[PDB]
């Protein structure tokens, strides 16, 4: 998260951590949506051009975290996976279209002041909240800067970083990129007129992008952290997998399957 701010304890009890067993390392973000179902970008688990094709017995989900490196005992909770469901039409060759994946915990997770599920929107929440100009929030432990040869400081978060970013209008997203945009992917970030800055970044993929509904005081996941060109660069924005669009699939996989 570029130019973000440190979170607070229990500020996003749904942010999960994709942890690789060996080497031991931070894979990406995720989201507890049910006591036994987590959510993630498809590319954290699948990426032929880089040899990623993880199996469940190759990963760990750490919930309750806040510290990137420590091992917050009796606070966090580590869970093992039972199956990995990726979107059949996941398109890795050109633009990570349909960049979404569902993980099923070998066993259920209990809730505490730090482990709470996030809500998945409906057409009406999507309609009211998903609008150009409104602000959603992104949190994650990935890079603080875009890998630059000349940047001093070998930096990556001490603790869970958080940033609020506005939704931009689809035409603006499209004219900024030469990558083929798609209905299943939106963009956020300040525009060159605002002057400001902030962004998600390497390591942040798979992370939630939530919004709070003022009609019910409830947190809703509107997007998943996905891709971009560079991190925090001029006249550029970041892209999130439209969660509501692919929402039929999610539930298709969830309802009578892993219950």
């Amino acid at each position: 998260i570029v130019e973000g701010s440190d979170a607070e304890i229990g500020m996003s009890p749904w942010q999960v951590m994709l942890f690789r067993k060996s080497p031991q390392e931070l894979l990406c973000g995720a989201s507890l949506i049910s006591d036994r179902w987590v959510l993630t970008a498809a590319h954290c688990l699948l990426y032929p051009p880089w040899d990623k094709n993880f199996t469940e017995n190759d990963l760990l989900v750490r919930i309750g975290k806040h510290s990137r490196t420590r091992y917050e005992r009796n606070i966090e909770k580590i869970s093992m996976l039972e199956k990995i469901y990726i979107h059949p039409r996941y398109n890795w060759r050109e633009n990570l279209d349909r960049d979404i994946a569902l993980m099923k915990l070998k066993k259920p997770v209990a809730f505490s002041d730090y482990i709470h599920p996030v809500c998945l929107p409906d057409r009406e929440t999507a309609a009211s909240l998903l609008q150009a100009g409104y602000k959603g929030r992104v949190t994650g432990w990935g890079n603080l800067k875009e890998t630059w040869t000349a940047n001093v400081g070998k930096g990556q978060p001490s603790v869970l970083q958080v940033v609020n970013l506005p939704i931009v209008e689809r035409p603006v997203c499209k004219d900024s990129t030469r990558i083929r945009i798609t209905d299943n992917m939106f963009c956020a970030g300040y525009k060159p007129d605002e002057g400001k800055r902030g962004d998600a970044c390497e390591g942040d993929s798979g992370g939630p992008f939530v919004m709070k509904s003022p009609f019910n005081n409830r947190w809703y996941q509107m997007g998943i952290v996905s891709w971009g060109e560079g991190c925090d660069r001029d006249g550029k924005y970041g892209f999130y997998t439209h969660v509501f669009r692919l929402k039929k699939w999610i539930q298709k996989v969830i309802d009578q399957f892993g219950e």
Binding site: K21, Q24, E25, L26, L60, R68, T69, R70, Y71, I78, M80
Partner: peptide, 11 residues
């Protein structure tokens, strides 16, 4: 790196 974790979380 990361603080080692309970070995059990590798079964």
């Amino acid at each position: 790196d990361f603080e080692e974790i309970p070995e059990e979380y590798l079964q």
